[PDB]
Amino acid sequence: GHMGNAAAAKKGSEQESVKEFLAKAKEEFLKKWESPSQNTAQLDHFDRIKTLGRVMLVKHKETGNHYAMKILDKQKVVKLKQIEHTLNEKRILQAVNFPFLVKLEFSFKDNSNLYMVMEYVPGGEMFSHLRRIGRFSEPHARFYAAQIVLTFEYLHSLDLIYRDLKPENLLIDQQGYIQVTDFGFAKRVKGRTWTLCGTPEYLAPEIILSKGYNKAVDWWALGVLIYEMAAGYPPFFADQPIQIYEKIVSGKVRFPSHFSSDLKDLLRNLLQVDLTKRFGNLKNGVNDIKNHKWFATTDWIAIYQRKVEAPFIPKFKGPGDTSNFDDYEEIRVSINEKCGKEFTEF
């Protein structure tokens, strides 16, 4: 076969250890899912330094630690029918734990807004670095993709679907590793779900086609991400969403001539319209991806342990540094509490 005795035994044992890890991580997740944190800080505990994305860089007054404070206007969430999605986001973020998932440190609320205070990730969005450099070499792209594969293996084992993978939602930390942000569309889903949501270029065909869909939409989105990282542009590329959607459902994808055959084979199996053939949706699960030739040089444990040398370390001048984010142009807490009943659980 493809592997000899030593390699097949090591791989089988490694895969069993993954199962063991994931069973323990689910037990830990469920305890927090069932008893969520709430009201663990107040606005007066921080200084507002600068707007970073609203998301504000803030400084905790007692510790001097810097954080990214996401501010949600309760009234705008209701008008947008994102109430359940916003409740999903905070409940999920406070329950998960993984080295490539942004860490929610505090959350709280007041008359007008919801606040989520997360660890500050100073390296900026992958998006910026990718557009600046053009494209990532395949080893560079693979380093990031491996982190997403492990993160999705973790999330999906908890029955969580992420639903908004893209370079805009991936931050680079001080060691050059990825931090997944933006859990606004993440949902706990035992089997299928039906909401039409996500970002056009990254939507799986079954979403566009208004089907009940499952966690395999995330594996399709991984295909889009790897393609975009390695090409510099995504595989289904057009000025208007309707044109993007037509390309996605066609079952056709074209590749740059510099893509390796290994990469093209992986991407054809991720960007597979037929769900009975899509990697990540088959009997062998995530192992079809982790055991693919394009990942043959990936030491999955070493990636998880953050012991692999990153391809790129972002410039970092000091603890408050915002140089890897953009510039943006006050906080208005009202005297009357708004949409109190809709956000009781937050």
């Binding site: 947008l80 029918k81 998006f127 557009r131 949501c197 996500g198 270029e201 590329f237 000025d239």
Partner: peptide, 13 residues
């Protein structure tokens, strides 16, 4: 030709 800037999510269609 296609979108080169940051891309917004959609809540419906």
């Amino acid at each position: 030709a296609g979108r080169t800037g940051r891309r917004q999510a959609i809540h419906d269609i």
